[PDB]
Design a protein around this ligand. Structure first.
Ligand code: MG
Ligand code: MG
Ligand code: MG
Ligand code: MG
Ligand code: MG
Ligand code: MG
Ligand code: MG
Ligand code: MG
Ligand code: MG
Ligand code: MG
Ligand code: MG
Ligand code: MG
Ligand code: MG
Ligand code: MG
Ligand code: MG
Ligand code: MG
Ligand code: MG
Ligand code: MG
Ligand code: MG
Ligand code: MG
Ligand code: MG
Ligand code: MG
Ligand code: MG
Ligand code: MG
Ligand code: MG
Ligand code: MG
Ligand code: MG
Ligand code: MG
Ligand code: MG
Ligand code: MG
Ligand code: MG
Ligand code: MG
Ligand code: MG
Ligand code: MG
Ligand code: MG
Ligand code: MG
Ligand code: MG
Ligand code: MG
Ligand code: MG
Ligand code: MG
Ligand code: MG
Ligand code: MG
Ligand code: MG
Ligand code: MG
Ligand code: MG
Ligand code: MG
Ligand code: MG
Ligand code: MG
Ligand code: MG
Ligand code: MG
Ligand code: MG
Ligand code: MG
Ligand code: MG
Ligand code: MG
Ligand code: MG
Ligand code: MG
Ligand code: MG
Ligand code: MG
Ligand code: MG
Ligand code: MG
Ligand code: MG
Ligand code: MG
Ligand code: MG
Ligand code: MG
Ligand code: MG
Ligand code: MG
Ligand code: MG
Ligand code: MG
Ligand code: MG
Ligand code: MG
Ligand code: MG
Ligand code: MG
Ligand code: MG
Ligand code: MG
Ligand code: MG
Ligand code: MG
Ligand code: MG
Ligand code: MG
Ligand code: MG
Ligand code: MG
Ligand code: MG
Ligand code: MG
Ligand code: MG
Ligand code: MG
Ligand code: MG
Ligand code: MG
Ligand code: MG
Ligand code: MG
Ligand code: MG
Ligand code: MG
Ligand code: MG
Ligand code: MG
Ligand code: MG
Ligand code: MG
Ligand code: MG
Ligand code: MG
Ligand code: MG
Ligand code: MG
Ligand code: MG
Ligand code: MG
Ligand code: MG
Ligand code: MG
Lengths: 116, 56, 75, 92, 136
RNA sequence: GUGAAGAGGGAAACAACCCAGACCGCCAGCUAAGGUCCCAAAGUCAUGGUUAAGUGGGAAACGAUGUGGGAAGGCCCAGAC
RNA sequence: UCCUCCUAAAGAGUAACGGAGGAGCACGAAGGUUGGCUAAUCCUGGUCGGACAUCAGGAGGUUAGUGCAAUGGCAUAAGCC
RNA sequence: GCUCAACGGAUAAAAGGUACUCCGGGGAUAACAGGCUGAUACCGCCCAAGAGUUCAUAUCGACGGCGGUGUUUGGCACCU
RNA sequence: UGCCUGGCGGCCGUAGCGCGGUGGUCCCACCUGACCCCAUGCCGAACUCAGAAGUGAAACGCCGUAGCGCCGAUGGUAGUGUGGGGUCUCCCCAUGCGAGAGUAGGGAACUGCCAGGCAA
């Protein structure tokens, strides 16, 4: 199984980040689509969420699952997050190597105004 | 409502706890009819040293 | 005899018990390995010594997948 | 295979031993949606009853307060070395 | 003579033989020799009581030994002062509480069983009694 | 816990066991442990049983138609033991 | 002299010429951190090659490992890279 | 810069003999005897594989078991 | 309102295994490919990127099932604090506490925020 190997690969970051009590930006990648959601320091309730599965963002792009789409999500989430009042957050890469789409999402989230 | 407690046995070869309990009830010597307010505590104190006290 | 040796005892155990108000820095448990784990506002030193990181009342919890004992503090 | 039996009122270590030192012993009836029923009964009868192999198989009707309850002997506690019963679990 | 084949520890604390036994029901065989008294059975006593049974019932029948020593008893030599170590392990004993089935027997008559267990009972220090396998 | 560092009453006598903590006096009364036929203060007390061994008033494996209770299990009027 | 376990009577502590074992170091990577990984032992097939070297899959799941005793601990891995 | 490892380290630096002995002490501590104990010793008894031509119990009694004594070897160190 | 997915928790075996199923329009998965980003102590297996032909096989999710695990009374037993007592290596009595194992039975979890698709 792959999933389970990705969960335990993530867990250290998650458990460390819930201990500090920080608002984390979870980013689930998928072969088709990329997701993102800013979750409260308690961990249960979500404040902001956006993805390429949302038609509002899906209708604009060429294909939902690439660096240019991940930037469009990474911008979108950080556009909402500032309207809600969020600014200082952390970035939970969630067992995905900080390299392609997730880096494109992170850089877009930085460029959009979200402080981390 | 009060309860008349009486010490009916010596407190010589006794445990420090039981020696204390009598000091907490206010019993000094054998044949000392001390009356106390009836609460769940005092009944507990009496229950601790029931072997050496008598209730009226 | 063949043996007759022993080590000096280490004074390990729960120092501050559940409910007890502790100060920031106070040691809660000296132990060898993580019998108890660090929860909220509790640290864990090189010696696996759990200590308070904030002024509050010590709380012993039993949570997690493997059913482990955690020590948290709540002000 | 019919035994008269009283309902228990005291129950614990102190009561049970006092009871067993009076030619009786504690048993219990349970089964179905109804509540369990603690049952004091005579020793010398039930000692003679268990010699027969039917006792640990067939249905027994225990008489309690007039009412006859149908049961089977599920489990039983022998006294360690002396030939005598301590306790019987009657399933309904 | 029964003995553990290798152990973790050579010498063991004296302990306190208390409470009631657990091997109380007659499990394997039809008949059994239950220990009424309390005490301890040496390896020698068990073998001596086994030989006395086995010889009484002849080649026929089947016998179990529910007890096993697994407790080493030390003893200090003669003309030796106290201390200067724990003594040396001399014999092996099984602690027997009341209720313990010691021996079990099967494939013989009730008449010839009881007489076989008497001869064993005469070799043992503990007061014993006959017990039959009751169905539940 | 007691003695040590605690006298007094009991356990024959008996630091440590049971009862109980002596400030002094009285030719007063109630009790504790333990006792009540005589030595020696108080029941030859009352009721219902057991014990025949002087058990009580040292001791085991094992031995035995001792002797009391019980709860069962083998036979009768075709009359068993 | 120091460490580990039991004795030690479910906080700590606790003796004996009581019961068992270790230490008088090691390491510029065996530290730091970041990013990864998962073990034993079998089963079946396969050149030399056989019980066992290396490979493949399946079974088991921490019986493994932890620089060295024992203890407590570690998959978020303190394990191996 | 110290196996000051007798590891809170008396000196930088230290082994023996005394039946030729002596002083101060101790029944805080041994040797004799007493005491407590009874593993051992001694003396009984229980079971009875067997021996006794047959036959366990005339006489012996293996394997084991339970006591007594305070006679041995001891243990303890309570008196001196 | 409900039915289906994903994400992130709460709760950690009544929640886990096995077995029997069934699901692809989105969701998820394998699957396609290998200039580019990056990757292999060899290997686009993994990690990674560009895609959307293929299928729900495996995986994953959901429904069914006691195969086991797991939970689990009442009663009794063991143990034990305190005061007594005995035939004192061990017990017993008054009173307080009271298991473990087993037994009847229960049992193929339960939720919260959020996002999408479909019947509305
Ligand atoms: Mg007293
Ligand atoms: Mg006075
Ligand atoms: Mg020291
Ligand atoms: Mg230690
Ligand atoms: Mg110590
Ligand atoms: Mg630290
Ligand atoms: Mg009760
Ligand atoms: Mg209850
Ligand atoms: Mg009791
Ligand atoms: Mg039913
Ligand atoms: Mg013990
Ligand atoms: Mg046991
Ligand atoms: Mg068992
Ligand atoms: Mg000599
Ligand atoms: Mg020596
Ligand atoms: Mg003095
Ligand atoms: Mg006195
Ligand atoms: Mg006196
Ligand atoms: Mg006397
Ligand atoms: Mg007298
Ligand atoms: Mg006198
Ligand atoms: Mg006198
Ligand atoms: Mg004396
Ligand atoms: Mg008295
Ligand atoms: Mg006084
Ligand atoms: Mg005075
Ligand atoms: Mg006065
Ligand atoms: Mg008077
Ligand atoms: Mg009067
Ligand atoms: Mg009297
Ligand atoms: Mg007198
Ligand atoms: Mg008189
Ligand atoms: Mg008279
Ligand atoms: Mg006499
Ligand atoms: Mg007899
Ligand atoms: Mg009759
Ligand atoms: Mg030192
Ligand atoms: Mg301990
Ligand atoms: Mg302790
Ligand atoms: Mg303790
Ligand atoms: Mg020591
Ligand atoms: Mg050494
Ligand atoms: Mg390294
Ligand atoms: Mg290296
Ligand atoms: Mg290391
Ligand atoms: Mg890491
Ligand atoms: Mg990097
Ligand atoms: Mg290991
Ligand atoms: Mg270890
Ligand atoms: Mg453990
Ligand atoms: Mg490391
Ligand atoms: Mg020194
Ligand atoms: Mg030296
Ligand atoms: Mg020192
Ligand atoms: Mg020193
Ligand atoms: Mg020198
Ligand atoms: Mg000389
Ligand atoms: Mg001279
Ligand atoms: Mg002199
Ligand atoms: Mg002198
Ligand atoms: Mg001395
Ligand atoms: Mg001599
Ligand atoms: Mg002399
Ligand atoms: Mg002498
Ligand atoms: Mg004597
Ligand atoms: Mg003797
Ligand atoms: Mg004689
Ligand atoms: Mg004889
Ligand atoms: Mg004889
Ligand atoms: Mg012959
Ligand atoms: Mg003597
Ligand atoms: Mg003599
Ligand atoms: Mg004697
Ligand atoms: Mg002597
Ligand atoms: Mg002396
Ligand atoms: Mg002494
Ligand atoms: Mg003199
Ligand atoms: Mg559970
Ligand atoms: Mg299937
Ligand atoms: Mg399918
Ligand atoms: Mg498709
Ligand atoms: Mg591929
Ligand atoms: Mg691929
Ligand atoms: Mg298709
Ligand atoms: Mg379901
Ligand atoms: Mg069903
Ligand atoms: Mg089950
Ligand atoms: Mg539970
Ligand atoms: Mg259970
Ligand atoms: Mg429970
Ligand atoms: Mg209960
Ligand atoms: Mg008591
Ligand atoms: Mg008395
Ligand atoms: Mg008597
Ligand atoms: Mg309870
Ligand atoms: Mg239970
Ligand atoms: Mg059991
Ligand atoms: Mg259970
Ligand atoms: Mg059921
Ligand atoms: Mg059901
Ligand atoms: Mg289930
Ligand atoms: Mg069902």
């Amino acid at each position: 199984d792959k999933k389970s190997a990705r969960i335990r690969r993530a867990t250290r970051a998650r458990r460390k980040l819930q201990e500090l009590g920080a608002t984390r930006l979870v980013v689930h990648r998928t072969p088709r689509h990329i997701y993102a959601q800013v979750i409260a320091p308690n961990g249960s309730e979500v404040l902001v969420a956006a993805s390429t599965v949302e038609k509002a963002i899906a209708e604009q792009l060429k294909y939902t699952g690439n660096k240019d789409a991940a930037a469009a999500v990474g911008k979108a989430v950080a556009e909402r997050a500032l309207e809600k009042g969020i600014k200082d957050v952390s970035f939970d890469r969630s067992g995905f190597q900080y390299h392609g789409r997730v880096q494109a999402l992170a850089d877009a989230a930085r460029e959009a105004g979200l402080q981390f | 409502k009060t309860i008349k407690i009486t010490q009916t046995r010596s407190a010589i070869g006794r445990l420090p706890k039981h020696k204390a309990t009598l000091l907490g009830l206010g019993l000094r010597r054998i044949g000392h009819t001390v009356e106390r307010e009836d609460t769940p505590a005092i009944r507990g104190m009496i229950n601790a040293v029931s072997f050496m006290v008598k209730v009226e | 005899t063949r043996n007759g040796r022993d080590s000096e005892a280490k004074r390990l155990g729960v120092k501050r018990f559940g409910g007890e108000s502790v100060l920031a820095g106070s040691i809660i448990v000296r132990q060898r390995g993580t019998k108890f784990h660090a929860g909220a506002n509790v640290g864990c030193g090189r010696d696996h010594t759990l200590f308070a990181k904030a002024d509050g009342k010590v709380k012993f919890e039993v949570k997690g997948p493997k059913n482990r004992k955690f020590i948290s503090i709540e002000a | 295979f019919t035994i008269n039996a009283e309902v228990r009122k005291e129950q614990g270590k102190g009561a049970s031993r006092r009871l067993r030192a009076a030619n009786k012993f504690p048993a219990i009836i349970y089964g179905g949606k109804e509540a369990p029923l603690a049952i004091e009964l005579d020793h010398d009868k039930v000692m003679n009853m268990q010699a027969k192999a039917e006792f640990y198989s067939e249905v027994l009707t225990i008489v309690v307060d007039g009412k006859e309850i149908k049961v089977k002997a599920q489990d039983v506690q022998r006294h360690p070395y002396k030939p005598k019963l301590q306790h019987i679990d009657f399933v309904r | 003579m029964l003995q553990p084949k290798r152990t973790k520890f050579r010498k063991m604390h004296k302990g306190r033989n208390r409470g009631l036994a657990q091997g109380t029901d007659v499990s394997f065989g039809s008949f059994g020799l239950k220990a009424v008294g309390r005490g301890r059975l040496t390896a020698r006593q068990i073998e001596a009581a086994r030989r006395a049974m086995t010889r009484a019932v002849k080649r026929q029948g089947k016998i179990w030994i529910r007890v096993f020593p697994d407790k080493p008893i030390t003893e200090k030599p003669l003309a030796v002062r106290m201390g200067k170590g724990k003594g040396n392990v001399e014999y092996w004993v099984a602690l027997i509480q009341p209720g313990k089935v010691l021996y079990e027997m099967d494939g013989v008559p009730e008449e010839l069983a009881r007489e076989a267990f008497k001869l064993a009972a005469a070799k043992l220090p503990i007061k014993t009694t006959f017990v039959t396998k009751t169905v539940m």
